[PDB]
Design a protein around this ligand. Structure first.
Ligand SMILES: CC(=O)N[C@H]1[C@H](O[C@@H]2[C@H](O[C@]3(C(=O)O)C[C@H](O)[C@@H](NC(C)=O)[C@H]([C@H](O)[C@H](O)CO)O3)[C@@H](O)[C@H](O[C@H]3[C@H](O)[C@@H](O)[C@H](O)O[C@@H]3CO)O[C@@H]2CO)O[C@H](CO)[C@H](O)[C@@H]1O[C@@H]1O[C@H](CO)[C@H](O)[C@H](O)[C@H]1O
Ligand SMILES: CC(=O)N[C@H]1[C@H](O[C@@H]2[C@H](O[C@]3(C(=O)O)C[C@H](O)[C@@H](NC(C)=O)[C@H]([C@H](O)[C@H](O)CO)O3)[C@@H](O)[C@H](O[C@H]3[C@H](O)[C@@H](O)[C@H](O)O[C@@H]3CO)O[C@@H]2CO)O[C@H](CO)[C@H](O)[C@@H]1O[C@@H]1O[C@H](CO)[C@H](O)[C@H](O)[C@H]1O
Ligand SMILES: CC(=O)N[C@H]1[C@H](O[C@@H]2[C@H](O[C@]3(C(=O)O)C[C@H](O)[C@@H](NC(C)=O)[C@H]([C@H](O)[C@H](O)CO)O3)[C@@H](O)[C@H](O[C@H]3[C@H](O)[C@@H](O)[C@H](O)O[C@@H]3CO)O[C@@H]2CO)O[C@H](CO)[C@H](O)[C@@H]1O[C@@H]1O[C@H](CO)[C@H](O)[C@H](O)[C@H]1O
Lengths: 103, 103, 103, 103, 103
């Protein structure tokens, strides 16, 4: 139904679009208990995270959270340019809701 | 049974074949609740989606849906040329049913 | 226990070996209900399928069918030469049972 | 929520941080019973393990331990520079808790 | 726990270390009923299998077995030099227990 990341982002509160058009600068992954997350940063310093699964996530999001960590890792290793990120800004670091990669 | 994507596509109602013979221009992935989907684009603007798993899907296609999102991601990252897409035209963006990639 | 694809193939009824020594020309995959399959072709026109999972499959072949589809996808994308395929000939297109890849 | 590996590492006892800034030298993986683990080494001889999933692990970490081995395998194969490692030092070899890649 | 492949291999009966320092020559994969395994060979004729899961395997070894097949496949496709293999010499072909890669 939404046709791009901007329309999709617009369907949630506390979200904002970050136009990066750049490759991920660093990738951090954690298996530590209560911190099973991934954190990424860009050259400008901007930091984002894929949240630890919790009660704020419905069951359908379970699979998508894992896929997102897979995507980030591979985008990072292949140095793919990420166009935009839709993030929840009520979390720190900002939490990734969706990504767009282009060209 | 079907020997190719065209024959396969012809076995369903509301489907059509698109011949792109081009690489995916952009890939968008979302983990947002109720919008756990992927959307792809080609240079001419043509937009397609891998639908959110819902009641129209039988048990057997859930793994297939997951595999498709995986296929679109590497196809994108590797700039693989997609030959054809069999898509359901009763959805917007058009929903991907099958894909064919050729040398 | 088999030592190679040919001996493994010889243990089955209705099987046959095809020597290709060529890379995959086309990769096709479908998430369409009741047609969750993948189809590959070679320049010589040879067409093979990875069957839809079903009755003719034991619980151990399940993960293996999924694994074969991943193999065929990555082989296609990396342009790996397929040496031989052990195929069941009581199906059309011929269903894939095993694959060998040699440098 | 931590913004980097240094701060995330600091949220645990018996946890040390290691700045490597080199690609992994060796990758060892085992399927032997009771020894389903991975071991990595750096050219400076530093050796680290990804623990056999045991009782000291909560359920949320299970999927995470699998992801970490996938990450170690791909970072090794692509020769990615790993920046830092947060490791629990009450283990021998020291056990990987988190990893950061910044090339 | 062991700090390397030789020590690890020494913790089991009927095992031996083979130093290859060469890439995999051929990869064979089968989905055939009761023969869901992978066989790899090196140019020197060395042939090794990843056993079909059976009664000899404990529960914790089941994902390790699937992972090892992913590893062999990716190592093969990327021409990653395999250093050593720990194998059970009471099976034919000898069964892979652990693998070390160092390029
Ligand atoms: C803003 C918020 O607190 N969201 C939490 C969510 O709350 C639900 C309603 O929010 C939306 C949203 O997230 O913006 C509304 C959207 O239009 C929905 N969009 C679509 C396409 O469906 C989404 C979506 O359904 C869910 O996210 C699916 O999981 O939900 C929120 O407005 C509502 O609260 C109202 C209340 O109803 C109203 O009477 C009162 O006056 O004001 C409140 C705020 O406007 O309640 C809804 C739940 O009852 O609920 C989910 C759990 O489903 C989460 O808790 C969500 O929080 C975010 O979750 C993110 C990950 O999914 C991430 O962690 C964010 O940081 C969390 O805040
Ligand atoms: C067209 C439609 O509404 N399809 C929904 C489907 O409906 C079934 C019958 O449709 C087909 C079809 O999709 O074309 C008929 C094909 O020959 C079948 N092909 C094969 C290889 O089996 C497929 C297939 O069985 C299913 O897709 C597998 O899940 O189904 C449909 O024709 C039938 O309804 C008839 C009705 O019986 C008849 O009396 C009346 O005169 O005409 C109706 C319409 O032509 O009903 C069948 C279901 O009872 O059913 C599935 C669920 O099983 C879906 O709901 C499907 O909708 C599409 O699903 C897609 C994703 O899978 C996607 O979301 C599309 O946008 C949906 O429209
Ligand atoms: C040698 C053998 O038959 N091993 C089978 C194994 O047997 C167990 C004990 O064997 C070891 C081993 O595999 O070598 C001993 C190692 O030191 C252990 N190492 C570690 C780090 O724990 C391993 C390990 O625990 C298991 O492999 C985990 O599954 O096991 C063996 O010593 C023992 O012998 C007893 C006997 O049971 C008892 O009745 C008699 O009175 O005294 C003996 C004392 O000397 O029995 C253990 C089983 O209860 O068992 C596993 C299943 O647990 C396998 O069957 C294993 O066979 C090999 O398995 C490989 C795949 O896992 C491969 O397929 C080989 O081909 C199989 O031979």
């Amino acid at each position: 139904t939404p046709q791009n990341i901007t329309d999709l982002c617009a369907e949630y509160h506390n979200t904002q679009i970050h136009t990066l058009n750049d490759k991920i600068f660093s990738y951090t992954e954690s298996l530590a208990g209560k911190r099973e997350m991934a954190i990424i940063t860009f050259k400008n310093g901007a930091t984002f995270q894929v949240e630890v699964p919790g009660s704020q996530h419905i069951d359908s999001q379970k699979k998508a959270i894992e896929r997102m960590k897979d995507t980030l890792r591979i985008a990072y290793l292949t140095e793919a340019k990420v166009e935009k990120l839709c993030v929840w800004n009520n979390k720190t670091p900002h939490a990734i809701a969706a990504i767009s990669m282009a060209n």
